[PDB]
Every structure is written in C-alpha cells, then in structure tokens.
Amino acid sequence: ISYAAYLNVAAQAIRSTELQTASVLNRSQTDAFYTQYKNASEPTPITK
Amino acid sequence: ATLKEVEMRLKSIKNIEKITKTMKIVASTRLSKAEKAKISAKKMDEAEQLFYKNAETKNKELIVAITSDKGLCGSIHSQLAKAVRRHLNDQPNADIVTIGDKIKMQLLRTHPNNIKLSINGIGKDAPTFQESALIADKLLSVMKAGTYPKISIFYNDPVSSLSFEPSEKPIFNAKTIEQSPSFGKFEIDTDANVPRDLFEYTLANQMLTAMAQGYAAEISARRNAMDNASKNAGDMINRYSILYNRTRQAVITNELVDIITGASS
Amino acid sequence: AEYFRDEEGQDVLLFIDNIFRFTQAGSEVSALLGRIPSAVGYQPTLATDMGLLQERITTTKKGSVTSVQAVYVPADDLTDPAPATTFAHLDATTVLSRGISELGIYPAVDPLDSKSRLLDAAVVGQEHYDVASKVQETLQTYKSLQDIIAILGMDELSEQDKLTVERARKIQRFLSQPFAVAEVFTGIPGKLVRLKDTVASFKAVLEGKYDNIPEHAFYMVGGIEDVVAKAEKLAA
C-alpha cells in the first residue's frame, strides 16, 4: 500500500453527504483491471 | 472489370474518409478533457517540484511508458517505444511496466521477459487519481520499485495542443530523498518515516502527471493522424476519379466507333 | 497581319479568342462534306488545319507576325485529340486562370503553369535563366514548406524557413500590375511596366534589397520604377 493508495481509499470511503460534482465521484473509481505477466505467459488479471 | 474495380475501391476510400472524419471530430472532444485533467495534475506536481529543487534533484532500473488501449494514434505507439528501446541499451534486463495495450506490443517483441506488469483500462477510464494510486501501490510490492535506485518514466509531452514531443523525467526514488540533503535541509524528528511516505506519494503524483500529459500528446497526435488519413483518401478520390472517367470516354468512343462503322453499313 | 509583315516589314500581334470554337466549327465543316468525324467526334482533317494556321505565323527578314491565341478545352478534358494537338504547335505556354483572379491578382497568370521551351540557358542568356530559376524555386519550396508546419503545430517556422517565407510572399505581390481595362478588378487605375523593370525587380528581391519592404508595398504595382514610389510612402 502506497501513501497515495491509503489516502485514495480515504477519499473513496467518504463517497460511501453527496454534496459534489460528477468529476469528483469519477476520480475515486475506475473499471481498470491489471493483466499480470511472468518473467511471455500471463497469469490471470486480478481487479485493480 | 476496369470500370467497376476502380468504382468499388473508390467506395472503400470514401467510407474510410467518413470514418476518419467522424473519429477526428470526436478526438477534438477527448483532447479538451485530456488538457483540463493535465492542468490540475501538473499544478499538484509543481508543489513537490519546488521541494525537489531545494532538496537537490540528485539521484536495476524500471521503465514505464504511457499509451491508451485504443489505436489509430499515428506513430505515438512506436516512437515512444523507440525511446524505451534506446534506453534498453543501458541495461538489457530492465523491467518495463507498460501502461496501455498499444505500447505493450512493441516492448513485448524485443524482450518478452521484461513485460511483468501491464495495465488494461486506460482507454475506457481517463487518467484520474484512482488509477495512479492503485498502480503506485502495486509497483512497490510486485516490481521492487522502492529498493531500486533508478525509476524513469517515458511519455509524450503536450508542448502545445497540436503537437507532441517524446520526453522522459525521473520518478524521484526513496534513494534520492535519503542521500540528498533533506533530512538535513528539511526537518523531521522521528515522528514519521518521511522517505517511505513522501516517495510513495510522489510515485503517484508524478505518475498521474505523466499519464495525463501522455493522454493529451497522444490524442493530439491522433487528431493529426486521422486528419492526415482523410487527406490521403481525398488524393485518392481525385486520382481514381480521373482514371474511371477516361475509361467512360473510351467506352463512349467505342460506342461511337460502332456508330461510325454501322453508319458505313 | 501578314500583308504588313511582307511588304511593310512590320511587327504585329495576332489574337484569336477560342481555338476551341475553331475545332468545333471544323467538326461541322468536315461532316457536311461527307466525311466521318473521327478524332473522338471531331474532324479528321485536324492536324493539317492546325498546321496551316500555326506555320503562317513565322519570322521573315522583313518582319514577324506572332500570335497569342486562346485555347480552351471541352470541360477540362485533356485526353482528347484536340488539346494535345494544339499544345504541340505552341512554342511556349502561358496559363491564365480564374482562381488567381479572385485574390485581387492581375496578371492572373499562374507562375507554376507559366513554362516555355525557350527558357533555356542559351536563348535568354545565362543571367535571365538563373534569375527565372531562383524565382521559380522560391515559390515551389514555399508551398511544400507550409504543409508540415501546419500539421506539427501552429507557426513553428525556423529563421531559415521564414527567410523563405518572406521572400516567397513578397514575390507573389510583386507579380501584380493593374491594367486600365482591368481597373475595376484591382480597384486601382492602370500602370504600364516594361521588360527591363521585370528584370530589375527580381534581381533585387533575391538579394533582399526588397526584403526591407513589407508585403503590402508590392501589392498593386509592378516594376522597379513603380515600386520606388511605394517604398517611399511605406516609410514616410
């Protein structure tokens, strides 16, 4: 866990009063997954 | 025949122009979101940069590269790659993390080994804090980012919103904080592990900046590609149109030749 | 014209309007006599008719008739037997167009479809030829140079590149020359400019003696003498 991960998670948890604009809400989520790779072949993606 | 083979191929070029046209209009919309996002990112970054000068900028390596998952962006995919590969001469066994499907392809070929981590979801979801933060976290455990003395980022700088220049910068290592005066010029007692938090925070803030600047240089090159495609298709429309037309004139002439011979009969 | 030349030794200039309407009239004149018009629907007696016409215009030791003619094509078709056959006889070609005319340019002669087979290095001198070739070259590069600058950025011109721009665009203006008859088209009464002042102007613009003077101060005047007036007013 990066510092910026930790604090990100803080930002996110708070989006669990919804008094804010739409870009703000977007920034705290993403659909992105990361394809893991071996040192060629690819181990299965785990959600980012 | 001749006639019809001109005529169908011409349709292909015409459909292609329409597709490249539509796509370029759409590029212009994306470039604006890409720029707004870049400003805010770059400004956040600037505040750590004030610091890094005064600290003294100082000093296996890691390579990061920045692309969208979508293609048609001209030669961004491979020019950026070409600069990744040039610095692949300074160490063969360097671990390359490819951010976007398109840059992944060119680096995979030169060494399959160096692809260790790669990122899906750049094209659906624009550069934003969530991506960069999760990607900064995984770097530290998977890639041995922290225990590396070298980390460098490659991207495409959006010098202006109609241009792209490929550029590199360093992502200021925890080794850099340690051995630059900034436990001696910048104060903390022992109240926090300032290297292990500051590094991790500027891993992401710099990276976000590289992501937003790249998305903007790229989309800007893509508008250019899509424009240039539309022009190559236009040249081709005109040039095949003439080639068809002369054939019709030959056919009219042959019909008139039949009328001349038939008139003799 | 020829009477003048043969027995009074005079130099004369013979116009024709469309030589297209001479081909088209010629189609008809063949057909009535019984001939089959084949030349893609045009007279078969084509070659001889052009030959008589364009070989009665020559230099005798008395005088010379010379002809300026207007050649127009059937809807811009160059494929056809008629445009090629015409182009064959012509010693030089001067190409005038309406696209050029809308930019407030008289002579509207396009300097990249202005070409001669008498612009050789023996016919007009060594100097004249070199002066024409550098004046030709500047424009030719210029058009190309604008293409990739536009794609790369806005104005990304170098010191080297914009030396070429200055020179090119000053030269485009310098072509102008109002005509009394074309008073209305320039919006400016006529001027009369000569062969010597064509020459003087281009040597000077080449050497950047006329890269001291902006683009608008060549606009609506021709030769060297004329443009002395304009340089003076531009400064004072």
Swiss-Prot record, chain A:
Entry annotated with the keyword Repressor: no
GO BP, sorted A to Z: proton motive force-driven ATP synthesis; proton motive force-driven mitochondrial ATP synthesis
Keywords: ATP synthesis, CF(1), Hydrogen ion transport, Ion transport, Membrane, Mitochondrion, Mitochondrion inner membrane, Phosphoprotein, Transport
Compartmental location: Mitochondrion; Mitochondrion inner membrane
One GO term describing the cellular component: proton-transporting ATP synthase complex
Role summary: Mitochondrial membrane ATP synthase (F(1)F(0) ATP synthase or Complex V) produces ATP from ADP in the presence of a proton gradient across the membrane which is generated by electron transport complexes of the respiratory chain. F-type ATPases consist of two structural domains, F(1) - containing the extramembraneous catalytic core, and F(0) - containing the membrane proton channel, linked together by a central stalk and a peripheral stalk. During catalysis, ATP synthesis in the catalytic domain of F(1) is coupled via a rotary mechanism of the central stalk subunits to proton translocation.
UniProt protein name: ATP synthase subunit epsilon, mitochondrial
Gene from which the chain derives: ATP15
Curated annotation (Swiss-Prot), chain B:
Gene3D superfamilies xref list: 3.40.1380.10
Mutation effect (S264F): In allele ATP3a
Cellular localisation: Mitochondrion; Mitochondrion inner membrane
GO molecular function: proton-transporting ATP synthase activity, rotational mechanism
Membrane topology qualifier: Peripheral membrane protein
Biological function: Mitochondrial membrane ATP synthase (F(1)F(0) ATP synthase or Complex V) produces ATP from ADP in the presence of a proton gradient across the membrane which is generated by electron transport complexes of the respiratory chain. F-type ATPases consist of two structural domains, F(1) - containing the extramembraneous catalytic core, and F(0) - containing the membrane proton channel, linked together by a central stalk and a peripheral stalk. During catalysis, ATP synthesis in the catalytic domain of F(1) is coupled via a rotary mechanism of the central stalk subunits to proton translocation.
Protein name: ATP synthase subunit gamma, mitochondrial
Organism: Saccharomyces cerevisiae (strain ATCC 204508 / S288c) (Baker's yeast)
Upper classification of the organism: Eukaryota, Fungi, Dikarya, Ascomycota, Saccharomycotina
Curated annotation (Swiss-Prot), chain C:
Modified residues (Phosphoserine): S101
Compartmental location: Mitochondrion; Mitochondrion inner membrane
Function comment: Mitochondrial membrane ATP synthase (F(1)F(0) ATP synthase or Complex V) produces ATP from ADP in the presence of a proton gradient across the membrane which is generated by electron transport complexes of the respiratory chain. F-type ATPases consist of two structural domains, F(1) - containing the extramembraneous catalytic core, and F(0) - containing the membrane proton channel, linked together by a central stalk and a peripheral stalk. During catalysis, ATP synthesis in the catalytic domain of F(1) is coupled via a rotary mechanism of the central stalk subunits to proton translocation.
Summary of subunit composition and partner proteins: F-type ATPases have 2 components, CF(1) - the catalytic core - and CF(0) - the membrane proton channel. CF(1) has five subunits: alpha(3), beta(3), gamma(1), delta(1), epsilon(1). CF(0) has three main subunits: a, b and c.
Family according to the record: Belongs to the ATPase alpha/beta chains family.
More details: Present with 164000 molecules/cell in log phase SD medium.
The protein's name in its UniProt record: ATP synthase subunit beta, mitochondrial
